[PDB]
Ligand binder design. Structure first.
Ligand SMILES: N[C@H](COc1cncc(C2=NCC3=NN=CC3=C2)c1)CC1=C2C=CCC=C2N=C1
Lengths: 20, 336
């Protein structure tokens, strides 16, 4: 399930903004 | 509405043209605990000794702001924040600076981040998600009317107040612009295709982020995710999205329009502006007037135990605040 793939990904924490 | 905005633009312009400066001092506050930490600064729960009020104090390290070339963006943030006023925008109460740092004191939102509640709960029902989305719709209509672009919509930047309503925070990428802009900034999962493709963009990137938000709130995960940004960027520009089986047909229709790679067909950016959004089926049960007045029943009420409570925020490593004997970046921040 997508939910499972998401929970197992490294992107479930606070996401930092980008710029440079 | 157009009446409301007219008067709103008048008030914003006066403050925008004559921003307030140094309205407080560091030692007028009691440093309590860290609520968040970034690359060039941090935010702490603070207590104003004269009033006994609690606030969120954002401390920015001038030298780090310079190393990361975020000077103009920081000037934008303070100048914009001290001039806006909407029920869903956090209030900047004071701002000042010393030898080492820039300081922005805002209202403390005890409820914590939508992020936290979202991940814990998993996903919000459509009525819940719609309640928050509505608030973002009016906030953007407000901001956009002022020629402002927000550029950093995401659960991490939306707080829940006592009444269960949203409070948008972090205006580090906010900018007043008539015309196109090219700065590459924001968060991977939420970047519109125009930004990732370096092709000059406008307020339409905010409406795309809204589509990402609504999807994430309702599905429990973003429509475009992967372990590394480049992979995410690849999905974003592909113009391909899959919807959970539980998404209502109207919800899917709203998102197909918001997550439009073709920003000439993207809702919010069309001839009828935000109304193409507000008059959408998924929003039929929404009473925009009721929402703006905060008279609508909040689906979730984060409760706390009195002021100063930070249980709705994660714990962060504390770090003493130091101020050099020498001024550090005078000219760069003279207008702050
Ligand atoms: N993402 C985190 C939180 O970032 C915020 C940024 N700006 C304002 C806030 C608040 N504003 C008002 C308010 N009231 N209550 C809590 C509250 C919080 C939080 C960490 C992070 C940073 C922290 C410092 C500088 C730059 C950063 N980039 C990311």
């Amino acid at each position: 399930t997508t939910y499972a793939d998401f929970i197992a990904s490294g992107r479930t924490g606070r996401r930092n903004a980008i710029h440079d | 509405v157009k009446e409301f905005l007219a008067k709103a633009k008048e008030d914003f312009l006066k403050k925008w043209e004559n921003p307030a400066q140094n309205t407080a001092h560091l030692d007028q506050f009691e440093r309590i605990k860290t609520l968040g930490t970034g690359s060039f600064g941090r935010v702490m729960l603070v207590k104003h000794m004269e009033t006994g009020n609690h606030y969120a104090m954002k401390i920015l390290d001038k030298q780090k702001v310079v190393k990361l070339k975020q000077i103009e963006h920081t000037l934008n943030e303070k100048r914009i924040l001290q001039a806006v006023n909407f029920p869903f925008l956090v209030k900047l109460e004071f701002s000042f600076k010393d030898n080492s740092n820039l300081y922005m004191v805002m209202e403390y939102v005890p409820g914590g981040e939508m992020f936290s509640h979202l991940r814990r709960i998993g996903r919000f029902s459509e009525p819940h998600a719609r309640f928050y989305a509505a608030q973002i719709v009016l906030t953007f209509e407000y901001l956009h009317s002022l020629d402002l672009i927000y550029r950093d919509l995401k659960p991490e930047n939306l707080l829940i107040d006592q009444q269960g309503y949203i409070q948008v925070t972090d205006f580090g990428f906010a900018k007043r612009v008539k015309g196109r802009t090219w700065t590459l900034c924001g968060t991977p999962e939420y970047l519109a295709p125009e930004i990732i493709l370096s092709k000059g963009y406008n307020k339409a990137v905010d409406w795309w982020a809204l589509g990402v938000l609504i999807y994430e709130m309702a599905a429990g995960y973003p429509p475009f995710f992967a372990d590394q940004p480049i992979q995410i960027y690849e999905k974003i520009v592909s113009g391909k999205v899959r919807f959970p089986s539980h998404f209502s047909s109207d919800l899917k229709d709203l998102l197909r329009n918001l997550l439009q790679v073709d920003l000439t067909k993207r809702f919010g950016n069309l001839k009828n502006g935000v109304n193409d959004i507000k008059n959408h089926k998924w929003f039929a049960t929404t009473d925009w007037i009721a929402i703006y007045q905060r008279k609508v029943e909040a689906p979730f009420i984060p409760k706390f135990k009195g002021p100063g409570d930070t249980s709705n925020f994660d714990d962060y490593e504390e770090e003493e605040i130091r101020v050099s004997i020498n001024e550090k970046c005078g000219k760069e921040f003279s207008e702050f």
